[PDB]
A paper describes a structure:
In order to biochemically confirm the importance of the entire C-terminal region for catalysis, we generated a C-terminal truncation of CotB2 terminating at R294 (CotB2ΔC). Indeed, CotB2ΔC was an inactive mutant, not capable of catalysis as shown by GC/MS. Co-crystallisation of CotB2ΔC with FGGDP resulted in the open-state conformation with no substrate bound. Additionally, this data provides further evidence that the salt-bridge between D111 and R294 is not sufficient to fully close the active site. Interestingly, there are two Mg2+-ions bound in the CotB2ΔC structure. One is fully occupied Mg2+B and the other one is partially occupied Mg2+C, which can only be fully occupied if properly coordinated by the DDXD motif upon substrate binding and the accompanying conformational changes of the active site. In combination with structural and biochemical data we could point out the importance of the properly folded C-terminus for the enzymatic activity.
Numbering used by the authors:
A (entry chain A): 16 to 293
B (entry chain B): 16 to 292
The structure:
């Protein structure tokens, strides 16, 4: 099965919702050539002990979500920004990888090295723990009865799983040092930040990765909760997910102005990057 | 307004739900008089810097939730257990205290000192960070526009707020060393543990503290999302919450056996303790 018959309409309705409810467009962080080579050098060094060879073009496609989905107005720490670039990219490679090749003894110390290079001592522990928790979660739930139960029961249980499994809690806990904004720092550490952005990130990511994931037999996708071959059922389910995104976006506007900018930029920027060609 | 007309029926239906879906009864951890005195002295020392004397009796009514809602058969570390007894009690008094007497500079070192007595170096930092985040969240959100939005929009937004605000995540992150169970430790550190148990704990807590909290102008209660004065609207809302608890409980049974016993003892033990003295 496939969502191809809805690809155009659903893209348009996503963009329309964002135009009406966030308005402010995402903007791409521009890395200098120096910064980008430093980032790729770190990514390559981190995945070397696993024997993987990743092309420059691969790294650049991975890093685009960070370039598009941070909040450049509010950036204060570019060392922290580069850390997110590197941690996002190497996690991507680890999640795109045959779990038989998952060597935690070789990979985990490379994650700690990245965090220790770019963050202060306190922030390095926070960022590293979320990274460790993410990759351990991913490993723990491949072919787990829990994943099947949470992903097939209801939209609520699936998104409850996805708070961690899509990596947004990880993302928040390594991204707050970029902004040094006290309120945002707390929302990141309570995971309220991740809970507020999970659905908008996951619904978008799920729609544009449905065809690929179901072809590989993966179940971590909310559109498996409806009959995508029944146009009527699909339209109702898609409107419900838009209704979730909107509700979340409206409550996000009750947060302080910087924090709200970061959340909405993350959701809206993730849609731009996902629907972009590179 | 009041949920008093529904107290007996809802209590019976809560109990019925647990007998049908959890079956296994919660059991009370009993502390030796030495163990309990150790807990209380620590509690007292932690809150003295704030000028607070607290009776043994009041400490014991606070600690009851820990004695009832942990999973006695799986306990392996009683030092960790006493830490939870203490951290729970002193955060109770910090929650029921005037936000003007909130001295973060005095209290946070006492929390750290508790975690350092009872936990290993690594577990101390985890328990301490969750305690810090809880009391800081509690301070951030009094009179916060965010709290107003999250508690009045939808049940989903409300329970999303309570994952932290009712302290489950804190509870999970200071309780996992009690059990030394690797799956539970991960489920607690990702907060999936708190996410699975938030609604079961919140709905029961909200029902039985509704009258007190609404009379105090507090809005952190799912039952203000419905008209409790309209029996038909209240019954419908209550059944919706019962359905939430049943779905979570049925999903919890997919976790490994030890983890799910901990999750279910927590939710069921909380109900028992809530409805007791
Ligand atoms: Cl930590
Ligand atoms: Mg995907
Ligand atoms: Mg409170
Ligand atoms: Mg209450």
């Amino acid at each position: 099965s496939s969502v191809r018959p809805y690809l155009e309409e659903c893209t348009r309705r996503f963009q329309e919702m964002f135009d009406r409810h966030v308005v402010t467009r995402p903007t791409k962080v521009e890395l200098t050539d120096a910064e980008l080579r430093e980032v790729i050098d770190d990514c390559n060094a981190a995945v070397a002990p696993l024997g993987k060879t990743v092309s420059d073009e691969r790294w650049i496609s991975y890093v685009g979500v960070v370039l598009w989905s941070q909040s450049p107005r509010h950036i204060k720490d570019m060392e922290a920004f580069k850390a997110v670039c590197v941690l996002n990219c190497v996690t991507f490679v680890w999640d795109d990888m045959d779990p038989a090749l998952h060597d935690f003894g070789l990979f985990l110390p490379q994650l700690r090295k990245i965090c220790e290079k770019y963050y202060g001592p306190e922030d390095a522990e926070v960022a590293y723990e979320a990274a460790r928790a993410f990759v351990t979660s991913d490993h723990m739930f491949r072919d787990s009865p829990i994943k099947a139960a949470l992903c097939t029961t209801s939209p609520e249980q699936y998104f409850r799983f996805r708070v961690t499994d899509i990596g947004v809690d990880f993302w928040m806990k390594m991204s707050y040092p970029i902004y040094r904004h006290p309120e945002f720092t707390e929302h990141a550490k309570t995971s309220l930040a991740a809970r507020m952005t999970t659905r908008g990130l996951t619904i978008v990511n799920d729609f544009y990765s449905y065809d690929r994931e179901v072809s590989l037999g993966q179940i971590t996708n909310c559109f498996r909760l409806c009959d995508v071959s029944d146009e009527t059922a699909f339209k109702e389910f898609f409107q419900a997910r838009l209704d979730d995104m909107i509700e979340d976006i409206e409550c996000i506007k009750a947060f302080d102005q910087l924090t709200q900018d970061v959340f909405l930029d993350l959701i809206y920027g993730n849609f731009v990057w996902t629907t972009s060609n590179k």
